[PDB]
Amino acid sequence: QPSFRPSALVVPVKKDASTLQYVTTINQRTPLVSENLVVDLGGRFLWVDCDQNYVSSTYRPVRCRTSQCSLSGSIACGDCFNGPRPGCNNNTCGVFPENPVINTATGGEVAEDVVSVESTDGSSSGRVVTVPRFIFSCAPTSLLQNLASGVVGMAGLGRTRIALPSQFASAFSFKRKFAMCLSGSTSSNSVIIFGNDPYTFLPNIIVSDKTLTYTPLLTNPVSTSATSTQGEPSVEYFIGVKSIKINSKIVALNTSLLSISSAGLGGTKISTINPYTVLETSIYKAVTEAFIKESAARNITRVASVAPFGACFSTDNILSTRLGPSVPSIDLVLQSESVVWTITGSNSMVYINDNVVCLGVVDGGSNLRTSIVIGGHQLEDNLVQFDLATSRVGFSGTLLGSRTTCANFNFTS
Ligand SMILES: *[C@@H]1O[C@H](CO)[C@@H](O)[C@H](O)[C@H]1NC(C)=O
Ligand SMILES: *[C@@H]1O[C@H](CO)[C@@H](O)[C@H](O)[C@H]1NC(C)=O
Ligand SMILES: *[C@@H]1O[C@H](CO)[C@@H](O)[C@H](O)[C@H]1NC(C)=O
Ligand SMILES: *[C@@H]1O[C@H](CO)[C@@H](O)[C@H](O)[C@H]1NC(C)=O
């Protein structure tokens, strides 16, 4: 039959209750199997356990000195002193797959195999499409430590040619952009949509390049990975937060921490592997103290902290709103005073129980590589678009303002 090239792809994402990781699913191998993979926005590539329960007649090792090896970074050339199979081959290109949850990397072989996912028109699940020789990294079973039950690897979405967004765009000839719509649901799927906009969420809410607010995509010249070579830039997505307001009032910050130095320290990145936004200690202190004060001004009393949080509150006087609990707003001010990432109660707060709610940010310590890491809870129910062709990040704010959610995409497996 003819196989039409897609204009976009959709994969499901579901939050894991125990680990707070976001887990996607793709199909791979011959015969085709479903793979659950932890989403790593900042990861270099797809990596999978090739050592254990990996059977495929379409698997091919990527040899050293090939164009595929170059696409993967020409990091290493390896040999394996065990029997030949997926993950163990001679004269094979190597990389260092990383598990950022445990902050570990280890050597893995580069390989090709069939990857199959659903196309989309932006509104519903469509016909399946395939990349017959999708380049990925093998990894050992031990690298899976502390990942959600049932996963076999990680889906890296970072700024490399072989990461999912770029490799799908090149394979299918669509735009080098993707959109992530994470959910706090642990029972229902949300989505990542690779390729062209627009995106529809039930009932009829359109999110598109018209509706999104954009900010420049910045580059950190020093890697933020666990392994790297000298002179390698970060593959992560940075944005230029200049100031923070809480309840419309500036929270005074050390601005040198918000800039990215030539040594690669500072700035603001977006992460799916940190479940809560992580703040350098001085920023953490400033933000939490202002939030506590502004909360007290509306009769929301501070109560004992609940790990991992350091600013927790009684719910006695908190009103429920469409945009979440009625707590002080937090604005991350970007390239001008009129371009802001706004965090309403649905994204700022984490319920512990009926009586206690916490500000969902954590103290990352002092002398931290990245000063602000926008994490999973703060991404939920927001559509975030990463456009590598135009070097921009777009964001919707909470979809609750439009009476929809990220789990309201019309996805069918
Ligand atoms: C690689 O070559 C070495 C040395 O000849 C050999 O001992 C080993 O079995 C080989 N590994 C394979 C083919 O995966
Ligand atoms: C601000 O951050 C820089 C970078 O760490 C540091 O050198 C400086 O001492 C800090 N300033 C204040 C007022 O804490
Ligand atoms: C609420 O807090 C405000 C500001 O602190 C205070 O002036 C007011 O008395 C409080 N209202 C109560 C406790 O009903
Ligand atoms: C999902 O989209 C398909 C294609 O239009 C449609 O047939 C189906 O009824 C939709 N499902 C929901 C729940 O809207």
Side-chain angles (χ1 to χ4, degrees), residues 12-48:
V13 182
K14 186 175 293 181
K15 187 179 184 178
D16 182 62
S18 179
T19 66
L20 313 177
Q21 294 160 22
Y22 301 91
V23 179
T24 192
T25 307
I26 68 179
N27 287 73
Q28 185 167 331
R29 315 176 203 187
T30 305
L32 199 73
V33 303
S34 183
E35 296 176 330
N36 291 343
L37 302 165
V38 173
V39 176
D40 183 8
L41 176 63
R44 290 185 176 96
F45 42 60
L46 173 61
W47 67 252
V48 176

mmCIF file of all heavy atoms in Angstrom, residues 12-48:
data_model
loop_
_atom_site.group_PDB
_atom_site.id
_atom_site.type_symbol
_atom_site.label_atom_id
_atom_site.label_comp_id
_atom_site.label_asym_id
_atom_site.label_seq_id
_atom_site.Cartn_x
_atom_site.Cartn_y
_atom_site.Cartn_z
ATOM 1 N N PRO A 12 1.649 8.507 23.791
ATOM 2 C CA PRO A 12 0.997 8.715 25.082
ATOM 3 C C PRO A 12 2.045 8.887 26.171
ATOM 4 O O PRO A 12 3.141 8.329 26.071
ATOM 5 C CB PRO A 12 0.211 7.429 25.257
ATOM 6 C CG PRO A 12 1.083 6.371 24.610
ATOM 7 C CD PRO A 12 1.691 7.080 23.419
ATOM 8 N N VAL A 13 1.654 9.578 27.241
ATOM 9 C CA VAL A 13 2.503 9.752 28.403
ATOM 10 C C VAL A 13 1.636 9.572 29.636
ATOM 11 O O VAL A 13 0.549 10.141 29.717
ATOM 12 C CB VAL A 13 3.144 11.152 28.418
ATOM 13 C CG1 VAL A 13 4.075 11.292 29.624
ATOM 14 C CG2 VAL A 13 3.853 11.442 27.120
ATOM 15 N N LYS A 14 2.108 8.826 30.609
ATOM 16 C CA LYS A 14 1.368 8.635 31.837
ATOM 17 C C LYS A 14 2.315 8.770 33.009
ATOM 18 O O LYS A 14 3.403 8.157 33.049
ATOM 19 C CB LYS A 14 0.677 7.279 31.870
ATOM 20 C CG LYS A 14 -0.213 7.061 33.028
ATOM 21 C CD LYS A 14 -0.973 5.745 32.974
ATOM 22 C CE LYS A 14 -2.023 5.633 31.848
ATOM 23 N NZ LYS A 14 -2.784 4.330 31.823
ATOM 24 N N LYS A 15 1.927 9.553 34.020
ATOM 25 C CA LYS A 15 2.711 9.718 35.214
ATOM 26 C C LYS A 15 2.668 8.440 36.072
ATOM 27 O O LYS A 15 1.597 7.882 36.281
ATOM 28 C CB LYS A 15 2.183 10.904 35.987
ATOM 29 C CG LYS A 15 3.035 11.288 37.177
ATOM 30 C CD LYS A 15 2.418 12.501 37.838
ATOM 31 C CE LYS A 15 3.231 12.998 38.962
ATOM 32 N NZ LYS A 15 2.581 14.227 39.523
ATOM 33 N N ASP A 16 3.824 8.052 36.574
ATOM 34 C CA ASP A 16 3.937 6.924 37.484
ATOM 35 C C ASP A 16 3.787 7.405 38.925
ATOM 36 O O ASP A 16 4.498 8.291 39.369
ATOM 37 C CB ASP A 16 5.310 6.284 37.289
ATOM 38 C CG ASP A 16 5.493 5.068 38.175
ATOM 39 O OD1 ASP A 16 4.708 4.106 37.998
ATOM 40 O OD2 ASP A 16 6.422 5.061 39.021
ATOM 41 N N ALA A 17 2.855 6.807 39.644
ATOM 42 C CA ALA A 17 2.552 7.299 40.986
ATOM 43 C C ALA A 17 3.711 7.176 41.953
ATOM 44 O O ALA A 17 3.935 8.068 42.745
ATOM 45 C CB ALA A 17 1.325 6.552 41.539
ATOM 46 N N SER A 18 4.434 6.070 41.909
ATOM 47 C CA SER A 18 5.478 5.792 42.882
ATOM 48 C C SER A 18 6.728 6.652 42.680
ATOM 49 O O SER A 18 7.300 7.130 43.631
ATOM 50 C CB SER A 18 5.911 4.282 42.831
ATOM 51 O OG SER A 18 6.945 4.052 43.784
ATOM 52 N N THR A 19 7.135 6.823 41.443
ATOM 53 C CA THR A 19 8.369 7.506 41.137
ATOM 54 C C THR A 19 8.187 8.955 40.704
ATOM 55 O O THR A 19 9.153 9.702 40.684
ATOM 56 C CB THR A 19 9.157 6.803 40.032
ATOM 57 O OG1 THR A 19 8.446 6.873 38.806
ATOM 58 C CG2 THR A 19 9.511 5.350 40.379
ATOM 59 N N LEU A 20 6.991 9.325 40.286
ATOM 60 C CA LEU A 20 6.691 10.651 39.729
ATOM 61 C C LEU A 20 7.341 10.874 38.374
ATOM 62 O O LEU A 20 7.365 12.010 37.878
ATOM 63 C CB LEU A 20 7.008 11.800 40.711
ATOM 64 C CG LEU A 20 6.496 11.576 42.113
ATOM 65 C CD1 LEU A 20 6.946 12.745 42.986
ATOM 66 C CD2 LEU A 20 4.993 11.447 42.140
ATOM 67 N N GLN A 21 7.845 9.827 37.748
ATOM 68 C CA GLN A 21 8.350 9.888 36.376
ATOM 69 C C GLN A 21 7.200 9.881 35.386
ATOM 70 O O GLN A 21 6.108 9.385 35.667
ATOM 71 C CB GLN A 21 9.276 8.701 36.138
ATOM 72 C CG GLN A 21 10.524 8.772 36.983
ATOM 73 C CD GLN A 21 11.230 7.447 37.159
ATOM 74 O OE1 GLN A 21 11.077 6.521 36.382
ATOM 75 N NE2 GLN A 21 12.072 7.378 38.199
ATOM 76 N N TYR A 22 7.454 10.411 34.206
ATOM 77 C CA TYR A 22 6.489 10.404 33.112
ATOM 78 C C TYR A 22 6.917 9.340 32.128
ATOM 79 O O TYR A 22 8.061 9.360 31.661
ATOM 80 C CB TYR A 22 6.410 11.809 32.454
ATOM 81 C CG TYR A 22 6.002 12.852 33.451
ATOM 82 C CD1 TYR A 22 6.969 13.539 34.168
ATOM 83 C CD2 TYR A 22 4.675 13.139 33.725
ATOM 84 C CE1 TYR A 22 6.629 14.455 35.154
ATOM 85 C CE2 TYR A 22 4.294 14.045 34.702
ATOM 86 C CZ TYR A 22 5.287 14.700 35.423
ATOM 87 O OH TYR A 22 5.020 15.614 36.422
ATOM 88 N N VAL A 23 6.028 8.421 31.820
ATOM 89 C CA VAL A 23 6.355 7.221 31.045
ATOM 90 C C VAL A 23 5.622 7.259 29.723
ATOM 91 O O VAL A 23 4.388 7.358 29.687
ATOM 92 C CB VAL A 23 6.013 5.956 31.821
ATOM 93 C CG1 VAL A 23 6.338 4.711 31.009
ATOM 94 C CG2 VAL A 23 6.747 5.932 33.154
ATOM 95 N N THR A 24 6.375 7.209 28.621
ATOM 96 C CA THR A 24 5.798 7.122 27.291
ATOM 97 C C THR A 24 5.899 5.687 26.795
ATOM 98 O O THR A 24 6.517 4.825 27.410
ATOM 99 C CB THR A 24 6.434 8.161 26.345
ATOM 100 O OG1 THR A 24 5.681 8.256 25.137
ATOM 101 C CG2 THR A 24 7.850 7.837 25.974
ATOM 102 N N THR A 25 5.295 5.451 25.637
ATOM 103 C CA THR A 25 5.311 4.143 25.020
ATOM 104 C C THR A 25 5.549 4.334 23.511
ATOM 105 O O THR A 25 4.930 5.196 22.878
ATOM 106 C CB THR A 25 3.965 3.438 25.248
ATOM 107 O OG1 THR A 25 3.687 3.447 26.652
ATOM 108 C CG2 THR A 25 3.895 2.077 24.646
ATOM 109 N N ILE A 26 6.438 3.507 22.969
ATOM 110 C CA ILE A 26 6.625 3.389 21.520
ATOM 111 C C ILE A 26 6.645 1.896 21.204
ATOM 112 O O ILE A 26 6.736 1.057 22.100
ATOM 113 C CB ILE A 26 7.921 4.073 21.006
ATOM 114 C CG1 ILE A 26 9.178 3.340 21.494
ATOM 115 C CG2 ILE A 26 7.935 5.532 21.392
ATOM 116 C CD1 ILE A 26 10.496 3.947 21.006
ATOM 117 N N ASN A 27 6.589 1.545 19.937
ATOM 118 C CA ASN A 27 6.807 0.145 19.532
ATOM 119 C C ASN A 27 8.146 0.082 18.802
ATOM 120 O O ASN A 27 8.578 1.018 18.142
ATOM 121 C CB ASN A 27 5.651 -0.332 18.655
ATOM 122 C CG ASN A 27 4.385 -0.545 19.518
ATOM 123 O OD1 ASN A 27 3.741 0.433 19.967
ATOM 124 N ND2 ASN A 27 4.126 -1.772 19.906
ATOM 125 N N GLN A 28 8.800 -1.074 18.950
ATOM 126 C CA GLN A 28 10.132 -1.268 18.384
ATOM 127 C C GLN A 28 10.328 -2.750 18.114
ATOM 128 O O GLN A 28 9.663 -3.586 18.736
ATOM 129 C CB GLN A 28 11.170 -0.732 19.396
ATOM 130 C CG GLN A 28 12.633 -0.721 18.946
ATOM 131 C CD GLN A 28 13.532 0.101 19.856
ATOM 132 O OE1 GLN A 28 13.127 1.068 20.494
ATOM 133 N NE2 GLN A 28 14.802 -0.273 19.895
ATOM 134 N N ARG A 29 11.320 -3.069 17.285
ATOM 135 C CA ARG A 29 11.871 -4.401 17.070
ATOM 136 C C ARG A 29 11.037 -5.194 16.066
ATOM 137 O O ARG A 29 9.918 -4.825 15.717
ATOM 138 C CB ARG A 29 11.983 -5.231 18.392
ATOM 139 C CG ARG A 29 12.570 -4.432 19.547
ATOM 140 C CD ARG A 29 12.585 -5.211 20.842
ATOM 141 N NE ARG A 29 12.618 -4.257 21.976
ATOM 142 C CZ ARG A 29 12.774 -4.593 23.241
ATOM 143 N NH1 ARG A 29 12.829 -5.850 23.606
ATOM 144 N NH2 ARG A 29 12.911 -3.642 24.157
ATOM 145 N N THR A 30 11.585 -6.338 15.630
ATOM 146 C CA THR A 30 10.844 -7.311 14.859
ATOM 147 C C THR A 30 10.994 -8.679 15.542
ATOM 148 O O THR A 30 12.114 -9.223 15.588
ATOM 149 C CB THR A 30 11.327 -7.369 13.395
ATOM 150 O OG1 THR A 30 11.272 -6.065 12.822
ATOM 151 C CG2 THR A 30 10.479 -8.349 12.589
ATOM 152 N N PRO A 31 9.913 -9.253 16.067
ATOM 153 C CA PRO A 31 8.529 -8.723 16.063
ATOM 154 C C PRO A 31 8.407 -7.496 16.933
ATOM 155 O O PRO A 31 9.163 -7.246 17.867
ATOM 156 C CB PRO A 31 7.688 -9.870 16.626
ATOM 157 C CG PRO A 31 8.616 -10.507 17.538
ATOM 158 C CD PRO A 31 9.979 -10.506 16.822
ATOM 159 N N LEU A 32 7.414 -6.712 16.591
ATOM 160 C CA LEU A 32 7.166 -5.452 17.240
ATOM 161 C C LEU A 32 6.721 -5.705 18.682
ATOM 162 O O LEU A 32 5.810 -6.535 18.939
ATOM 163 C CB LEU A 32 6.151 -4.761 16.394
ATOM 164 C CG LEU A 32 6.035 -3.295 16.571
ATOM 165 C CD1 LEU A 32 7.259 -2.628 15.937
ATOM 166 C CD2 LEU A 32 4.736 -2.825 15.884
ATOM 167 N N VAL A 33 7.320 -4.984 19.648
ATOM 168 C CA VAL A 33 6.921 -4.998 21.040
ATOM 169 C C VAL A 33 6.712 -3.553 21.489
ATOM 170 O O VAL A 33 7.324 -2.623 20.998
ATOM 171 C CB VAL A 33 7.916 -5.694 21.950
ATOM 172 C CG1 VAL A 33 8.172 -7.128 21.492
ATOM 173 C CG2 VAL A 33 9.169 -4.945 22.061
ATOM 174 N N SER A 34 5.835 -3.403 22.467
ATOM 175 C CA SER A 34 5.583 -2.130 23.087
ATOM 176 C C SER A 34 6.673 -1.900 24.162
ATOM 177 O O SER A 34 6.939 -2.805 24.973
ATOM 178 C CB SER A 34 4.175 -2.159 23.682
ATOM 179 O OG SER A 34 3.822 -0.933 24.259
ATOM 180 N N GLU A 35 7.283 -0.731 24.162
ATOM 181 C CA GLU A 35 8.326 -0.345 25.114
ATOM 182 C C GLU A 35 7.813 0.848 25.923
ATOM 183 O O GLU A 35 7.517 1.903 25.352
ATOM 184 C CB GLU A 35 9.600 0.092 24.390
ATOM 185 C CG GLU A 35 10.249 -1.010 23.580
ATOM 186 C CD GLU A 35 11.435 -0.556 22.789
ATOM 187 O OE1 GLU A 35 11.389 0.696 22.405
ATOM 188 O OE2 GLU A 35 12.367 -1.308 22.498
ATOM 189 N N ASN A 36 7.814 0.698 27.252
ATOM 190 C CA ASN A 36 7.597 1.814 28.136
ATOM 191 C C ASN A 36 8.951 2.439 28.460
ATOM 192 O O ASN A 36 9.927 1.738 28.738
ATOM 193 C CB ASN A 36 6.848 1.393 29.387
ATOM 194 C CG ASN A 36 5.365 1.007 29.092
ATOM 195 O OD1 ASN A 36 4.792 1.340 28.047
ATOM 196 N ND2 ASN A 36 4.733 0.538 30.122
ATOM 197 N N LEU A 37 9.000 3.774 28.387
ATOM 198 C CA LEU A 37 10.241 4.523 28.439
ATOM 199 C C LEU A 37 10.030 5.762 29.289
ATOM 200 O O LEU A 37 9.023 6.475 29.123
ATOM 201 C CB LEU A 37 10.637 4.977 27.039
ATOM 202 C CG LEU A 37 10.832 3.889 25.998
ATOM 203 C CD1 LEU A 37 10.848 4.516 24.611
ATOM 204 C CD2 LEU A 37 12.070 3.060 26.242
ATOM 205 N N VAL A 38 10.963 6.070 30.184
ATOM 206 C CA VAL A 38 10.844 7.307 30.954
ATOM 207 C C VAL A 38 11.209 8.471 30.053
ATOM 208 O O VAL A 38 12.262 8.480 29.393
ATOM 209 C CB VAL A 38 11.725 7.268 32.208
ATOM 210 C CG1 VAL A 38 11.736 8.606 32.907
ATOM 211 C CG2 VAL A 38 11.248 6.154 33.132
ATOM 212 N N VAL A 39 10.337 9.481 30.019
ATOM 213 C CA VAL A 39 10.584 10.688 29.242
ATOM 214 C C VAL A 39 11.652 11.536 29.889
ATOM 215 O O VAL A 39 11.541 11.928 31.051
ATOM 216 C CB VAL A 39 9.290 11.509 29.143
ATOM 217 C CG1 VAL A 39 9.542 12.840 28.419
ATOM 218 C CG2 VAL A 39 8.178 10.728 28.404
ATOM 219 N N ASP A 40 12.694 11.838 29.123
ATOM 220 C CA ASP A 40 13.807 12.674 29.591
ATOM 221 C C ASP A 40 13.988 13.800 28.585
ATOM 222 O O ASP A 40 14.672 13.643 27.564
ATOM 223 C CB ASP A 40 15.073 11.867 29.743
ATOM 224 C CG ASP A 40 16.231 12.664 30.297
ATOM 225 O OD1 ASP A 40 16.018 13.825 30.714
ATOM 226 O OD2 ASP A 40 17.351 12.104 30.310
ATOM 227 N N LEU A 41 13.363 14.930 28.869
ATOM 228 C CA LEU A 41 13.378 16.062 27.963
ATOM 229 C C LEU A 41 14.787 16.420 27.570
ATOM 230 O O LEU A 41 15.042 16.738 26.414
ATOM 231 C CB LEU A 41 12.621 17.219 28.614
ATOM 232 C CG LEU A 41 12.616 18.515 27.840
ATOM 233 C CD1 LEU A 41 11.929 18.379 26.525
ATOM 234 C CD2 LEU A 41 12.004 19.588 28.697
ATOM 235 N N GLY A 42 15.707 16.381 28.540
ATOM 236 C CA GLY A 42 17.074 16.759 28.324
ATOM 237 C C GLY A 42 18.005 15.637 27.891
ATOM 238 O O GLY A 42 19.202 15.875 27.792
ATOM 239 N N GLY A 43 17.506 14.421 27.636
ATOM 240 C CA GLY A 43 18.351 13.282 27.291
ATOM 241 C C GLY A 43 18.803 13.297 25.826
ATOM 242 O O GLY A 43 18.138 13.765 24.929
ATOM 243 N N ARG A 44 19.973 12.698 25.573
ATOM 244 C CA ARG A 44 20.563 12.716 24.235
ATOM 245 C C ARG A 44 19.846 11.818 23.235
ATOM 246 O O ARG A 44 19.947 12.070 22.034
ATOM 247 C CB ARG A 44 22.015 12.292 24.297
ATOM 248 C CG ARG A 44 22.976 13.258 24.954
ATOM 249 C CD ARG A 44 24.392 12.726 24.801
ATOM 250 N NE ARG A 44 25.420 13.597 25.312
ATOM 251 C CZ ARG A 44 25.977 13.523 26.502
ATOM 252 N NH1 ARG A 44 25.612 12.606 27.371
ATOM 253 N NH2 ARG A 44 26.936 14.349 26.810
ATOM 254 N N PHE A 45 19.255 10.716 23.689
ATOM 255 C CA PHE A 45 18.800 9.735 22.709
ATOM 256 C C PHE A 45 17.790 8.801 23.331
ATOM 257 O O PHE A 45 17.533 8.787 24.541
ATOM 258 C CB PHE A 45 19.986 9.062 22.006
ATOM 259 C CG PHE A 45 21.141 8.696 22.942
ATOM 260 C CD1 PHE A 45 20.922 7.832 23.969
ATOM 261 C CD2 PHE A 45 22.351 9.222 22.700
ATOM 262 C CE1 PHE A 45 21.960 7.497 24.805
ATOM 263 C CE2 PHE A 45 23.438 8.899 23.575
ATOM 264 C CZ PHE A 45 23.219 8.033 24.601
ATOM 265 N N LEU A 46 17.170 7.992 22.468
ATOM 266 C CA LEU A 46 16.470 6.800 22.929
ATOM 267 C C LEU A 46 17.523 5.805 23.419
ATOM 268 O O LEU A 46 18.469 5.512 22.668
ATOM 269 C CB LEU A 46 15.721 6.190 21.749
ATOM 270 C CG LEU A 46 15.053 4.828 22.007
ATOM 271 C CD1 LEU A 46 14.009 4.905 23.107
ATOM 272 C CD2 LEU A 46 14.453 4.301 20.707
ATOM 273 N N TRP A 47 17.367 5.277 24.623
ATOM 274 C CA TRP A 47 18.182 4.155 25.039
ATOM 275 C C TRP A 47 17.277 3.074 25.613
ATOM 276 O O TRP A 47 16.266 3.358 26.234
ATOM 277 C CB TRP A 47 19.362 4.513 25.972
ATOM 278 C CG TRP A 47 19.088 5.011 27.337
ATOM 279 C CD1 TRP A 47 19.273 6.304 27.780
ATOM 280 C CD2 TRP A 47 18.778 4.242 28.505
ATOM 281 N NE1 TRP A 47 19.107 6.382 29.125
ATOM 282 C CE2 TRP A 47 18.808 5.134 29.611
ATOM 283 C CE3 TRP A 47 18.536 2.877 28.742
ATOM 284 C CZ2 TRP A 47 18.625 4.691 30.919
ATOM 285 C CZ3 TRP A 47 18.334 2.452 30.051
ATOM 286 C CH2 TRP A 47 18.361 3.351 31.110
ATOM 287 N N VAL A 48 17.685 1.822 25.354
ATOM 288 C CA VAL A 48 16.901 0.641 25.706
ATOM 289 C C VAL A 48 17.846 -0.428 26.223
ATOM 290 O O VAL A 48 18.970 -0.554 25.734
ATOM 291 C CB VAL A 48 16.132 0.140 24.446
ATOM 292 C CG1 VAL A 48 15.356 -1.136 24.693
ATOM 293 C CG2 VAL A 48 15.213 1.232 23.884
#
